[PDB]
């Protein structure tokens, strides 16, 4: 998320056993990264291996 130029990144890892779709459940995300950069971001992309 972006709040007043601050980029906030929360994450959470969990072990699952499923290959079809998303396993239904509940899981919280703790605050991990907060960067005071101030870049207006409108698009993004991913990169696999």
């Amino acid at each position: 998320k972006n709040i007043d130029g601050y980029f906030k990144i929360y994450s959470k890892h969990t072990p699952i056993n499923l290959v079809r779709d998303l396993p239904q459940g509940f899981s919280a995300l703790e605050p991990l990264v907060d960067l005071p950069i101030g870049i207006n971001i409108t698009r993004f992309q991913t990169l696999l291996a």
Binding site: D4, G5, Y6, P36, I37, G38
Partner: protein, 48 residues
Amino acid sequence: FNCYFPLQSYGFQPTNGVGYQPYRVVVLSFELLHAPATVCGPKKSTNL
């Protein structure tokens, strides 16, 4: 003639006067835009 080098050299010698000695000068210019501040005061703490 009529075409001189743009840069000239400093004649720094230890036997010259104070006005000819090399002086190191640093200008600290602070910029504060609408972006969040990232270089902030130390805010020295006290005992508890």
